[PDB]
Amino acid sequence: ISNDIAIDLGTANTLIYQKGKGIVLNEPSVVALRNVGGRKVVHAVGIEAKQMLMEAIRPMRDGVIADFEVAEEMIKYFIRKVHNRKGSGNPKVIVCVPSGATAVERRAINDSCLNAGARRVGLIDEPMAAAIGAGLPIHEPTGSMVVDIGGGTTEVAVLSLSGIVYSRSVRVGGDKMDEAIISYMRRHHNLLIGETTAERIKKEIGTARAPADGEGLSIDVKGRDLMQGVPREVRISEKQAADALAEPVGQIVEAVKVALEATPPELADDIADKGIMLTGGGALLRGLDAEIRDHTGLPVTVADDPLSCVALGCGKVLEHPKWMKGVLESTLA
Ligand SMILES: Nc1ncnc2c1ncn2[C@@H]1O[C@H](COP(=O)(O)OP(=O)(O)O)[C@@H](O)[C@H]1O
Ligand SMILES: [Mg+2]
């Protein structure tokens, strides 16, 4: 029985695919730090940390390693958590990393896996894993565009010839959408709300396009009054949430358009045929596909299972390592 794993080390969520088992771990990429005698201690990791949240730290939140020690501890914790005692002790590991990850960041990730016992580590770039999981024909000379909207980043890439031809990331994704909602409630309604409430609003009435409709549906939002601090409830409409999200949505649209203008022709025309493939959790924002379509004049398809696409692509590379080439940049023990 195998301990080989592929890790989607996301800005917001970490997923681990295990050989012969599938996705065995899907947890937020968060650590709870405790202050003990002026020292900071990694007290809890993942869903256990989120459930007890001490200071919250998301060490990968912006698509770069913010805290190396904490990121390493988080990686080791997750690897240890999925380890099977009755399985091999020296597994092969794949980790998905952002395209712009630096040598130092990549070395840190490789070392984390080697220090947890891996006999070999291969790194794969996020948009390649996303394309593979979305089922894009990244072997053909046909141009493909994938737009992966995650937590702290959106990555856009043009693929062909088993390779990335263009890639660019911007620090706008689902986190900035939540922050926009938090900011809207504070400035427009004098109401302090937390990330959990912001995410519920985004999922329930959040949308990339205002209702022609008028104001659309509405929900009740519970928070604390800004000046007072007393619990207060405020009704918010789909129109209002659309207003709140307009700015980060606009920045995601701009990222796609910037990528398009930088797309080396020939490839331009291969794109307007089958369009753009959206993946990542951020792609689940209602109407974002239509909004991108309307402002690029390009067709837009949302990948099946956009939250899991990267993990499933990594898993496919893990299971069928002969299927493709040098998608992996590898390091042995
Ligand atoms: N139904 C939904 N509507 C809008 N956003 C969503 C939905 N479900 C999840 N998300 C968002 O997806 C983002 C996480 O996407 P993910 O691809 O896991 O990011 P990363 O790979 O960077 O960790 C979060 O900001 C989360 O709020
Ligand atoms: Mg991701």
Side-chain angles (χ1 to χ4, degrees):
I1 170 257
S2 187
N3 265 309
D4 295 345
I5 52 172
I7 309 177
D8 174 11
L9 189 60
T11 66
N13 300 291
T14 293
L15 284 75
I16 299 182
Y17 177 98
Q18 188 173 62
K19 239 214 226 174
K21 281 220 187 174
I23 299 179
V24 297
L25 179 148
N26 186 344
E27 292 190 34
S29 305
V30 62
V31 173
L33 289 185
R34 169 101 84 87
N35 239 88
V36 181
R39 323 155 175 123
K40 280 157 192 306
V41 175
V42 170
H43 175 92
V45 174
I47 189 67
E48 298 159 269
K50 217 242 311 183
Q51 286 171 356
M52 75 174 57
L53 275 161
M54 281 186 311
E55 185 183 354
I57 182 239
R58 293 175 54 218
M60 314 288 292
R61 69 187 307 130
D62 294 315
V64 301
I65 304 175
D67 189 323
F68 276 75
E69 184 147 338
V70 174
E72 170 157 11
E73 291 306 305
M74 180 186 76
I75 296 177
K76 292 184 150 78
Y77 183 93
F78 286 140
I79 290 179
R80 207 134 291 150
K81 183 168 181 176
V82 305
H83 181 82
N84 198 328
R85 296 199 180 170
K86 322 171 121 166
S88 163
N90 62 347
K92 305 224 177 57
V93 178
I94 290 176
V95 193
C96 185
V97 300
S99 296
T102 64
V104 173
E105 293 177 321
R106 297 173 172 262
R107 174 75 182 179
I109 291 161
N110 283 324
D111 288 348
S112 292
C113 298
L114 294 173
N115 293 335
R119 74 165 165 280
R120 174 187 294 236
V121 187
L123 301 187
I124 180 166
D125 288 343
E126 174 116 354
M128 178 63 66
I132 291 166
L136 292 178
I138 73 277
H139 279 290
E140 316 209 316
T142 324
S144 296
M145 177 173 279
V146 67
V147 176
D148 178 351
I149 306 167
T153 62
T154 295
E155 288 228 21
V156 185
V158 181
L159 297 310
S160 52
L161 302 149
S162 293
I164 298 180
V165 170
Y166 174 82
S167 88
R168 178 174 182 255
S169 65
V170 295
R171 299 189 183 189
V172 189
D175 293 344
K176 284 290 170 37
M177 292 179 198
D178 294 343
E179 289 156 20
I181 290 166
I182 292 168
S183 181
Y184 174 84
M185 294 306 302
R186 172 198 187 90
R187 298 174 300 107
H188 275 65
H189 294 290
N190 291 23
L191 191 72
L192 300 193
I193 66 166
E195 244 81 10
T196 310
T197 294
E199 222 198 4
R200 173 165 27 93
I201 293 166
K202 186 177 69 179
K203 298 186 180 180
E204 302 188 354
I205 50 167
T207 180
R209 302 204 293 185
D213 182 299
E215 277 226 273
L217 283 358
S218 68
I219 59 174
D220 290 319
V221 179
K222 291 208 171 69
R224 292 169 215 143
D225 186 84
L226 219 194
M227 294 77 198
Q228 304 225 80
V230 48
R232 181 160 55 97
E233 187 167 67
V234 177
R235 272 236 160 234
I236 297 301
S237 72
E238 190 176 340
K239 160 88 104 201
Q240 288 170 317
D243 286 347
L245 293 164
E247 209 285 317
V249 166
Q251 294 173 310
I252 288 171
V253 175
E254 179 72 7
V256 178
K257 297 190 63 277
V258 163
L260 289 167
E261 191 185 74
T263 291
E266 340 253 349
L267 308 163
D269 286 288
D270 301 285
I271 312 300
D273 185 73
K274 267 330 127 178
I276 289 157
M277 181 61 82
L278 292 193
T279 196
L284 291 164
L285 179 70
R286 281 208 293 129
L288 177 59
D289 61 333
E291 183 78 349
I292 293 169
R293 177 165 57 241
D294 289 355
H295 293 98
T296 61
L298 256 52
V300 175
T301 304
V302 179
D304 202 82
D305 200 348
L307 276 160
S308 307
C309 276
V310 166
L312 296 175
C314 293
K316 182 183 209 183
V317 174
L318 187 76
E319 296 276 10
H320 307 111
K322 298 171 176 36
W323 177 66
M324 69 179 322
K325 66 131 211 283
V327 271
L328 300 179
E329 289 172 10
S330 302
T331 302
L332 292 106

Short mmCIF file of all heavy atoms in Angstrom, two decimals, residues 28-60:
data_model
loop_
_atom_site.label_atom_id
_atom_site.label_comp_id
_atom_site.label_asym_id
_atom_site.label_seq_id
_atom_site.Cartn_x
_atom_site.Cartn_y
_atom_site.Cartn_z
N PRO A 28 -8.14 24.04 5.43
CA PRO A 28 -7.64 25.40 5.21
C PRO A 28 -6.16 25.51 5.52
O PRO A 28 -5.64 24.87 6.42
CB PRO A 28 -8.46 26.25 6.19
CG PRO A 28 -8.95 25.26 7.23
CD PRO A 28 -9.14 23.96 6.52
N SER A 29 -5.47 26.36 4.77
CA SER A 29 -4.04 26.52 4.90
C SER A 29 -3.75 27.55 5.97
O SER A 29 -3.24 28.65 5.69
CB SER A 29 -3.44 26.98 3.57
OG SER A 29 -3.80 26.06 2.55
N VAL A 30 -4.07 27.21 7.21
CA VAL A 30 -4.03 28.17 8.29
C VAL A 30 -3.39 27.49 9.49
O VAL A 30 -3.50 26.27 9.64
CB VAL A 30 -5.46 28.68 8.63
CG1 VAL A 30 -6.35 27.54 9.10
CG2 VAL A 30 -5.42 29.79 9.67
N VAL A 31 -2.67 28.27 10.30
CA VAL A 31 -2.08 27.78 11.54
C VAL A 31 -2.54 28.70 12.66
O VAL A 31 -2.76 29.89 12.46
CB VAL A 31 -0.55 27.76 11.44
CG1 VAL A 31 0.08 27.41 12.78
CG2 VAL A 31 -0.09 26.78 10.37
N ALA A 32 -2.73 28.13 13.85
CA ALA A 32 -2.99 28.93 15.04
C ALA A 32 -1.69 29.04 15.81
O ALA A 32 -1.11 28.01 16.18
CB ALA A 32 -4.04 28.28 15.89
N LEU A 33 -1.22 30.26 16.04
CA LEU A 33 0.01 30.49 16.78
C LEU A 33 -0.35 30.90 18.20
O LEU A 33 -1.29 31.68 18.40
CB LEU A 33 0.84 31.60 16.14
CG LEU A 33 1.55 31.35 14.81
CD1 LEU A 33 2.42 32.55 14.45
CD2 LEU A 33 2.40 30.11 14.90
N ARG A 34 0.38 30.38 19.17
CA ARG A 34 0.20 30.77 20.56
C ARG A 34 1.45 31.49 21.04
O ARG A 34 2.56 31.08 20.72
CB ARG A 34 -0.02 29.53 21.42
CG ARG A 34 0.05 29.82 22.91
CD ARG A 34 -1.33 29.93 23.51
NE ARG A 34 -1.83 28.60 23.83
CZ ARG A 34 -1.58 27.98 24.98
NH1 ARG A 34 -0.87 28.57 25.92
NH2 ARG A 34 -2.05 26.75 25.18
N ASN A 35 1.28 32.55 21.82
CA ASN A 35 2.42 33.21 22.45
C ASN A 35 2.78 32.56 23.79
O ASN A 35 1.97 32.56 24.71
CB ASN A 35 2.15 34.69 22.64
CG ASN A 35 3.15 35.56 21.92
OD1 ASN A 35 2.98 35.89 20.75
ND2 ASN A 35 4.23 35.92 22.62
N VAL A 36 3.97 31.98 23.87
CA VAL A 36 4.47 31.39 25.12
C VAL A 36 5.86 31.94 25.40
O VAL A 36 6.80 31.68 24.64
CB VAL A 36 4.54 29.84 25.06
CG1 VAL A 36 5.04 29.30 26.39
CG2 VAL A 36 3.19 29.25 24.77
N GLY A 37 5.97 32.72 26.47
CA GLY A 37 7.24 33.33 26.85
C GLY A 37 7.95 34.07 25.73
O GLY A 37 9.15 33.85 25.51
N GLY A 38 7.23 34.92 25.01
CA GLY A 38 7.81 35.68 23.92
C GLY A 38 8.19 34.85 22.70
O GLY A 38 8.71 35.38 21.72
N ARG A 39 7.93 33.54 22.77
CA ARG A 39 8.18 32.65 21.64
C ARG A 39 6.85 32.42 20.95
O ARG A 39 5.81 32.42 21.60
CB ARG A 39 8.73 31.30 22.14
CG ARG A 39 9.69 31.39 23.35
CD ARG A 39 9.70 30.08 24.17
NE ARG A 39 10.69 30.08 25.25
CZ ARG A 39 10.41 29.87 26.54
NH1 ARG A 39 9.16 29.65 26.94
NH2 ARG A 39 11.39 29.88 27.45
N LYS A 40 6.85 32.25 19.63
CA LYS A 40 5.62 31.87 18.94
C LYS A 40 5.61 30.37 18.65
O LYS A 40 6.56 29.82 18.11
CB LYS A 40 5.43 32.67 17.64
CG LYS A 40 4.87 34.06 17.89
CD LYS A 40 5.20 35.01 16.76
CE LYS A 40 4.89 36.44 17.16
NZ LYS A 40 3.48 36.57 17.63
N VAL A 41 4.51 29.72 19.04
CA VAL A 41 4.40 28.27 18.91
C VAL A 41 3.30 27.90 17.93
O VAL A 41 2.19 28.42 18.03
CB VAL A 41 4.08 27.62 20.27
CG1 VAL A 41 3.84 26.13 20.11
CG2 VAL A 41 5.20 27.87 21.25
N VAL A 42 3.61 27.02 16.98
CA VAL A 42 2.57 26.46 16.13
C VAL A 42 1.73 25.51 16.97
O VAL A 42 2.16 24.40 17.27
CB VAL A 42 3.19 25.72 14.94
CG1 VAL A 42 2.13 24.93 14.19
CG2 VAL A 42 3.89 26.71 14.02
N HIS A 43 0.54 25.96 17.34
CA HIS A 43 -0.30 25.27 18.32
C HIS A 43 -1.30 24.32 17.65
O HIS A 43 -1.60 23.23 18.16
CB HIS A 43 -1.03 26.33 19.16
CG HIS A 43 -2.02 25.79 20.14
ND1 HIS A 43 -1.69 25.48 21.46
CD2 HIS A 43 -3.34 25.52 20.03
CE1 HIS A 43 -2.76 25.05 22.08
NE2 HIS A 43 -3.78 25.06 21.24
N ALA A 44 -1.81 24.71 16.48
CA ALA A 44 -2.75 23.87 15.77
C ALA A 44 -2.61 24.20 14.28
O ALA A 44 -2.10 25.26 13.92
CB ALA A 44 -4.15 24.14 16.21
N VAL A 45 -3.02 23.26 13.44
CA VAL A 45 -2.90 23.41 11.98
C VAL A 45 -4.20 23.00 11.30
O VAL A 45 -4.87 22.05 11.74
CB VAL A 45 -1.77 22.50 11.45
CG1 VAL A 45 -1.72 22.53 9.90
CG2 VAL A 45 -0.42 22.91 12.02
N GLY A 46 -4.57 23.68 10.22
CA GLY A 46 -5.68 23.20 9.41
C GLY A 46 -7.06 23.38 10.00
O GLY A 46 -7.33 24.40 10.66
N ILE A 47 -7.93 22.41 9.76
CA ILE A 47 -9.32 22.54 10.18
C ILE A 47 -9.37 22.61 11.71
O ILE A 47 -10.20 23.33 12.27
CB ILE A 47 -10.20 21.43 9.58
CG1 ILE A 47 -11.68 21.71 9.85
CG2 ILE A 47 -9.82 20.06 10.10
CD1 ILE A 47 -12.20 22.93 9.11
N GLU A 48 -8.45 21.93 12.38
CA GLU A 48 -8.38 21.97 13.84
C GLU A 48 -8.04 23.38 14.33
O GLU A 48 -8.56 23.83 15.36
CB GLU A 48 -7.37 20.93 14.35
CG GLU A 48 -7.76 19.49 14.01
CD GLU A 48 -6.59 18.50 14.04
OE1 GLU A 48 -5.94 18.30 12.99
OE2 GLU A 48 -6.33 17.91 15.11
N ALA A 49 -7.18 24.07 13.59
CA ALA A 49 -6.82 25.44 13.93
C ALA A 49 -8.01 26.36 13.70
O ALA A 49 -8.36 27.17 14.56
CB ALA A 49 -5.63 25.89 13.09
N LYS A 50 -8.62 26.24 12.53
CA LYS A 50 -9.77 27.07 12.20
C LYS A 50 -10.91 26.85 13.20
O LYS A 50 -11.59 27.80 13.58
CB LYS A 50 -10.26 26.75 10.78
CG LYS A 50 -10.74 27.97 10.01
CD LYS A 50 -12.21 27.83 9.65
CE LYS A 50 -12.51 26.49 9.00
NZ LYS A 50 -13.94 26.37 8.57
N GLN A 51 -11.11 25.60 13.62
CA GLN A 51 -12.18 25.27 14.56
C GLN A 51 -11.92 25.81 15.98
O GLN A 51 -12.87 25.99 16.74
CB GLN A 51 -12.45 23.76 14.59
CG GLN A 51 -13.18 23.22 13.36
CD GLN A 51 -13.24 21.70 13.31
OE1 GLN A 51 -12.67 21.02 14.16
NE2 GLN A 51 -13.93 21.17 12.30
N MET A 52 -10.67 26.06 16.32
CA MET A 52 -10.36 26.63 17.64
C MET A 52 -10.05 28.13 17.59
O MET A 52 -9.90 28.77 18.63
CB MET A 52 -9.26 25.83 18.36
CG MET A 52 -7.85 26.06 17.84
SD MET A 52 -6.60 25.23 18.85
CE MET A 52 -7.17 23.54 18.77
N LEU A 53 -9.96 28.69 16.39
CA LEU A 53 -9.76 30.13 16.24
C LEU A 53 -11.09 30.89 16.26
O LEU A 53 -12.14 30.33 15.91
CB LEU A 53 -8.99 30.44 14.95
CG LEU A 53 -7.47 30.35 15.04
CD1 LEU A 53 -6.81 30.21 13.66
CD2 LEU A 53 -6.95 31.57 15.77
N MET A 54 -4.82 33.36 20.70
CA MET A 54 -4.02 32.83 19.60
C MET A 54 -4.21 33.59 18.29
O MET A 54 -5.27 34.15 18.03
CB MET A 54 -4.29 31.33 19.39
CG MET A 54 -3.58 30.45 20.39
SD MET A 54 -3.77 28.70 20.01
CE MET A 54 -5.54 28.63 19.76
N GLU A 55 -3.16 33.60 17.47
CA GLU A 55 -3.11 34.38 16.25
C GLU A 55 -3.28 33.44 15.05
O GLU A 55 -2.61 32.40 14.98
CB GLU A 55 -1.75 35.07 16.19
CG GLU A 55 -1.50 36.05 15.06
CD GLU A 55 -0.08 36.60 15.10
OE1 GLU A 55 0.67 36.30 16.06
OE2 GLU A 55 0.31 37.33 14.16
N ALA A 56 -4.18 33.79 14.13
CA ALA A 56 -4.32 33.04 12.88
C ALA A 56 -3.24 33.48 11.91
O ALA A 56 -3.00 34.68 11.73
CB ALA A 56 -5.68 33.26 12.28
N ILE A 57 -2.56 32.51 11.29
CA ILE A 57 -1.62 32.84 10.23
C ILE A 57 -1.85 31.94 9.01
O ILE A 57 -1.92 30.72 9.12
CB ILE A 57 -0.14 32.77 10.68
CG1 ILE A 57 0.77 33.18 9.52
CG2 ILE A 57 0.21 31.39 11.26
CD1 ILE A 57 1.76 32.14 9.11
N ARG A 58 -2.01 32.58 7.86
CA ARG A 58 -2.09 31.87 6.59
C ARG A 58 -0.77 32.11 5.88
O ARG A 58 -0.55 33.18 5.31
CB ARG A 58 -3.27 32.42 5.76
CG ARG A 58 -4.64 32.12 6.39
CD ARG A 58 -5.79 32.77 5.62
NE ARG A 58 -5.76 32.41 4.20
CZ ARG A 58 -6.05 33.24 3.20
NH1 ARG A 58 -6.39 34.50 3.46
NH2 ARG A 58 -5.99 32.81 1.95
N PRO A 59 0.14 31.14 5.95
CA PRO A 59 1.53 31.39 5.55
C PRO A 59 1.73 31.49 4.04
O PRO A 59 2.80 31.90 3.60
CB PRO A 59 2.29 30.16 6.09
CG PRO A 59 1.24 29.12 6.29
CD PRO A 59 -0.02 29.83 6.62
N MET A 60 0.71 31.11 3.27
CA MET A 60 0.78 31.18 1.82
C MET A 60 -0.25 32.14 1.25
O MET A 60 -0.51 32.11 0.04
CB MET A 60 0.50 29.80 1.22
CG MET A 60 1.24 28.68 1.89
SD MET A 60 2.99 28.74 1.48
CE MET A 60 2.94 28.32 -0.26
#
